[PDB]
Enzyme design. Structure first.
Site, PDB file in Angstrom:
ATOM      1  N   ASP A 200       0.737  -0.904   0.202  1.00 13.69           N
ATOM      2  CA  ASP A 200      -0.242  -0.050   0.017  1.00 13.69           C
ATOM      3  C   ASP A 200       1.010   1.186   0.266  1.00 13.69           C
ATOM      4  OD1 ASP A 200      -2.661  -1.620   0.498  1.00 13.69           O
ATOM      5  OD2 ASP A 200      -1.702  -1.495   1.807  1.00 13.69           O
ATOM      6  N   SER A 201       2.285   0.969  -0.737  1.00 18.73           N
ATOM      7  CA  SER A 201       2.503   2.011  -1.049  1.00 18.73           C
ATOM      8  C   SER A 201       3.067   3.248  -1.764  1.00 18.73           C
ATOM      9  CB  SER A 201       4.178   2.168  -0.667  1.00 18.73           C
ATOM     10  OG  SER A 201       4.893   3.388  -0.325  1.00 18.73           O
TER      11      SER A 201
END
Ligand SMILES: [Zn+2]
Ligand SMILES: [Zn+2]
Ligand SMILES: [Zn+2]
Lengths: 49, 49, 242, 44, 48, 98, 49, 64
Positions: G9-10
């Site tokens: 989730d970056s």
């Protein structure tokens, strides 16, 4: 759903009852003393505000 | 195409305009360090200064 | 207190809350400064005072000054025999006078439960006990409130203020209360302006008997024009007035 | 020490001791004038 | 280590200043801790 | 009410800026009747007796920004897209959750 | 999956786009201070010490 | 608030096309036709004007 109105009306009656109670107490002191009371002075405006 | 080498990427990448949002959470608002800081006088323990 | 440097002005440090020798670096006191706390980085009278202030819709700073004055006068107790309500009214009057928005004794009597005589007596007693003084009221202090209670426009307010100031400068009203002069100026400004007011309404607003208004108006009656502002518009001529 | 009135935007020099208020407007909200000192911005 | 008589408080200890400090508020007005106020009450009644 | 005691309309932005409460004065007509067992009755009425101030919800019928056109709101430094429906209490915009 | 810096989730952002104002924002912090004359002895005022 | 000077994606100049873009729309051009008339071929640059909100116009409705 209690919206702003009904919520505010809930507070006002409690605060208005205190106002009416306060004038009763203020007037009772002067009536017992034998002197009429000033209505403007009997009302505590900070109760509702 | 690869930016570093310029070679075509074997897989074809799903790319297009999407609406993104910047959230209030910034890292600067969160990064914080403590190293022999201002302890409390009464408790003799760390506190913010 | 650097052991090497007797009588050295230690420098306070906010990093850890310690005092360091100004020229040694030696930390005297581990974390004693307490940085967080240091650097920012009798009843039934305050209630009555608040009620009086609310009846006038006056601001809270005046209320705090009145409370401070009440606490003081309760500390000296040079007027213990006086009723607490009278002391509160006197303190409120003193605070209103001090902050620069003075009211009249009749505007505190109409709010308090006592008469003007006791209000004045307690005012004098408090000024004597507290060993403080208040600047003398000027006719321009009651102009804004008097003309705001009335529906007079701002132009008429400025006209009345100028009339009253010039009249007091010209000594047309020697030894008369500033409130009566203000009432007379308001009356002449209203009669000359589009919006007219009778003596009764002005007397009620300013708390001045219509007879006093007439007495203070006849002294400045012949000098009506020169008191008016030079640039003053009106529909009823200033050249003719009752 | 110039303060700009929030109502009429009148620049008036106000001392520390005297009350804060518009000289002609009478308004009670005053904004400090921008500093005369020069601050550099890199257009980055 | 413990005796029944010692349970009765004949002499009351006073916590050090470190246990109860003199807080500073509104300038130099030293705000005494709650213990000091009770200690002030204790000594007043004790003297009386 | 200013320090001198002069009343003036309170704009919502001024309440926000000066940390005021957006409140409207409340008055009530009070009729007082007194009987002194002397076959006389005196009835005195105090018209518009001040009894307190009600906080006013912005952009409501009793708000100063009521019926003002979008241009008028901009003159008062108010956002026309601002929906109102909250109170200014000591300069803080307070919303009453249902 | 460009270089492994968007994992878990970056996000990988374009530095050139950021240089051009992409998702640039302002942060306004307002500080309020009032001077109170409560207490005859103490009277705090605004002035540079 | 105001039209960006450059397209974020490629750096193409976009700051001199908002007024022309509004003028073209007033000339009954479709949004796509106006963008083509302005030389915005890449959809990254078309995104710049198609999705721009000119808040500076309403910010000027408040007197300084
Ligand atoms: Zn040293
Ligand atoms: Zn102004
Ligand atoms: Zn582009």
């Amino acid at each position: 759903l209690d919206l702003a109105g009904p919520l505010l009306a809930f507070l006002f009656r409690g605060m208005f009852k205190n106002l009416l109670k306060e004038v009763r107490i203020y007037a009772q002191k002067f009536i017992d003393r034998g002197k009429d009371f000033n209505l403007e002075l009997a009302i505590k405006t900070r109760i509702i505000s | 195409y690869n930016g570093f080498t310029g070679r075509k990427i074997t897989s074809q990448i799903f790319i297009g305009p999407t609406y993104y949002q910047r959230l209030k959470h910034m890292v600067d608002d969160k990064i914080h360090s403590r190293a022999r800081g201002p302890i409390q006088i009464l408790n003799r323990q760390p506190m913010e200064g | 207190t650097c052991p090497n440097h007797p009588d050295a002005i230690l420098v306070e440090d906010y990093r850890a809350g310690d005092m360091i020798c100004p020229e040694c670096g030696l930390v005297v006191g581990d974390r004693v400064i307490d940085v967080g706390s240091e650097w920012r980085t009798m009843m039934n009278a305050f209630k009555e005072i608040t009620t009086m202030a609310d009846r006038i819709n006056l601001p809270r700073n005046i209320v705090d000054r009145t409370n401070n004055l009440f606490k003081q006068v309760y500390e000296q107790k040079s007027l213990k025999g006086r009723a607490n309500d009278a002391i509160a009214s006197a303190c409120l009057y003193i605070a209103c006078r001090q902050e620069g928005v003075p009211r009249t004794f009749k505007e505190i009597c109409a709010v308090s439960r006592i008469s003007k005589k006791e209000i004045g007596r307690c005012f004098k007693l408090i000024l004597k006990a507290l060993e403080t003084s208040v600047d003398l009221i000027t006719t321009g202090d009651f102009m804004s409130r008097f003309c705001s209670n009335l529906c007079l426009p701002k132009q008429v307010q400025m006209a009345a203020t100028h009339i009253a100031r010039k009249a007091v400068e010209l000594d047309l009203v020697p030894g008369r209360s500033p409130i009566s002069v203000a009432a007379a100026a308001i009356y002449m400004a209203s009669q000359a302006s589009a919006e007219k007011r009778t003596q009764k309404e002005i007397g009620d607003i300013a708390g001045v008997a219509d007879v006093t208004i007439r007495q203070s108006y006849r002294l400045i009656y012949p000098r009506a024009p020169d008191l008016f502002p030079t640039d003053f518009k009106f529909d009823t001529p200033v050249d003719k007035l009752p | 020490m110039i303060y700009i009135c929030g109502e009429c935007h009148t620049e008036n020099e106000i001392k520390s001791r005297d009350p804060i208020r518009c000289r002609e407007c009478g308004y009670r909200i005053m904004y400090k004038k921008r500093t005369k000192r020069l601050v550099v911005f890199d257009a980055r | 280590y413990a005796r029944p008589e010692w349970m009765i408080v004949t002499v009351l200890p006073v916590p050090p200043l470190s246990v109860r400090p003199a807080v500073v508020m509104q300038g130099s007005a030293r705000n005494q801790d709650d213990l000091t106020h009770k200690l002030a009450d204790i000594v007043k009644i004790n003297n009386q | 009410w200013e320090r001198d005691g002069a009343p003036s309309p309170m704009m919502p932005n001024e309440a926000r800026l000066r940390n005021l409460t957006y409140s409207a004065p409340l008055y009530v007509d009070i009729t007082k009747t007194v009987i002194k067992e002397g076959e006389e009755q005196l009835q005195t009425q105090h018209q518009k007796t001040f009894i307190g101030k009600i906080p006013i919800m912005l952009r409501s019928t009793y708000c100063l920004l009521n019926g003002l056109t979008d241009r008028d709101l901009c003159e008062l430094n108010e956002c026309p897209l601002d929906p109102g429906g909250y109170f200014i209490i000591n300069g803080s915009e307070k919303v009453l959750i249902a | 999956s460009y270089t492994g810096y968007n994992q878990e989730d970056s996000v990988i952002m374009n530095r050139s786009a950021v240089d051009r104002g992409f998702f640039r924002s302002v942060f306004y912090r307002s500080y309020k201070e009032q001077e109170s004359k409560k207490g005859f002895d103490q009277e705090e005022v605004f002035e540079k010490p | 608030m105001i039209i960006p000077v450059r397209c974020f994606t490629c750096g193409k100049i976009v700051g001199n096309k908002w007024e022309a873009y509004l003028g073209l729309l007033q000339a009954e051009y479709t949004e796509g036709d106006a963008l083509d008339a302005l030389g915005l071929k890449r959809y990254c640059c078309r995104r710049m004007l198609l999705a721009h909100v000119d808040l500076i116009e309403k910010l000027l409705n408040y007197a300084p």
